[PDB]
Amino acid sequence: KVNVPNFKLNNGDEIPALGYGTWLGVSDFDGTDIPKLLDALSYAIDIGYRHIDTAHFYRVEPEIGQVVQEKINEGVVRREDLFITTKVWQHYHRAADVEVSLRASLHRLGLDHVNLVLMHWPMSISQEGVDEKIDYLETWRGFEEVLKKGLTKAIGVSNFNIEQMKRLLTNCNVPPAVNQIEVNLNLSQADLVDYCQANEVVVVAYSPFGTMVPSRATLNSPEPKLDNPAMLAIGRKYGKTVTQVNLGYLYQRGIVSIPKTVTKSRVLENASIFDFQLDDEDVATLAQFDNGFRTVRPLFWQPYENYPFDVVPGQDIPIAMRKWKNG
Ligand SMILES: NC(=O)C1=CN([C@@H]2O[C@H](COP(=O)(O)OP(=O)(O)OC[C@H]3O[C@@H](n4cnc5c(N)ncnc54)[C@H](OP(=O)(O)O)[C@@H]3O)[C@@H](O)[C@H]2O)C=CC1
Numbered sequence: 001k002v003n004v005p006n007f008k009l010n011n012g013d014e015i016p017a018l019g020y021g022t023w024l025g026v027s028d029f030d031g032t033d034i035p036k037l038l039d040a041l042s043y044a045i046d047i048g049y050r051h052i053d054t055a056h057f058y059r060v061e062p063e064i065g066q067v068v069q070e071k072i073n074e075g076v077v078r079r080e081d082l083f084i085t086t087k088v089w090q091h092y093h094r095a096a097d098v099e100v101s102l103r104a105s106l107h108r109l110g111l112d113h114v115n116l117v118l119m120h121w122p123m124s125i126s127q128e129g130v131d132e133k134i135d136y137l138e139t140w141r142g143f144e145e146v147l148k149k150g151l152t153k154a155i156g157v158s159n160f161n162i163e164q165m166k167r168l169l170t171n172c173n174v175p176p177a178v179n180q181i182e183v184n185l186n187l188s189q190a191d192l193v194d195y196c197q198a199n200e201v202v203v204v205a206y207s208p209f210g211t212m213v214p215s216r217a218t219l220n221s222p223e224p225k226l227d228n229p230a231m232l233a234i235g236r237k238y239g240k241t242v243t244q245v246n247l248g249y250l251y252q253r254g255i256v257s258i259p260k261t262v263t264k265s266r267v268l269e270n271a272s273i274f275d276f277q278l279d280d281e282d283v284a285t286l287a288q289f290d291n292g293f294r295t296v297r298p299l300f301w302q303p304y305e306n307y308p309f310d311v312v313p314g315q316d317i318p319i320a321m322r323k324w325k326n327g
């Protein structure tokens, strides 16, 4: 029903250009919508989604793996058709711990291997908020170890800045396949994106709607909002909604998107974005929305070594970002 194209990774594998996000939010982690997430996942797989993005931190690996196993039992997919990502959090940054974190995630998900595993953030932080000051290069030796053990078909990073990427690419034995980071119309990350793509690292955009959608549109957050006349106008021109223009723009930059939704019509809508070329004029308009506004800026991590973003001077990590139970 939907046909999702694939980008090629620097390790020979394919990654679908759109994936299904599974984080429900600290909006106190909110488990209420788990059933809707699962039912919208099952529907996503029925219509042709294959890429699923998840993480230890998202609490729901056991439930995702159950859905996956059901879809395989029903004959809708084989394992080999799916691209599944998970991620290792900040308390498992010693080299030997990557294997423990990932084997556990793999047990939760019910899998022999994932397609991709990421270093969720470059900071090394204990469960009590101690900065363990472990170099991400040491952590990366563990990613390289779990790769050689066949626990994952690919290794990557998330929230690495251009400096961290450069240092990682200069020192690694196996390069990262992806850098997963925030990209949207207000935060284009042009330089980081260009640097990644010049080095054959694929960029995967989380929070691809930024503050455009009403769930995140807090006042004085920037345009575009869903009513934006220029967005709507670009919409009418190619026969698309505003969210579809947004995702198609990212697609057209060669960037993979992982929107999140619990709503089946959005699942379907989000995937109908591969049949239009935005022209030079509309690209230039869309580029004008870029203004450095970061939707996801966890100020509690500023003091840690390897915090990746620019520090706002003059500023306790909540418990839900350090300790939790799964399933
Ligand atoms: N590596 C990292 O550090 C991070 C990774 N992520 C990952 O990426 C995903 C990224 O998305 P996220 O940050 O959740 O935010 P998104 O930009 O995906 O937006 C989520 C919101 O958009 C709404 N929505 C989705 N589709 C549409 C549509 N077509 N029209 C109108 N509204 C829509 C949803 O509503 P509803 O659900 O009610 O339909 C939801 O409230 C996460 O699920 C996770 O997988 C996220 C943050 C950090």
Ligand SMILES: [Ca+2]
Residues within 6 Å of the ligand: 079, 111, 112, 113, 114
């Ligand atoms: Ca498997």
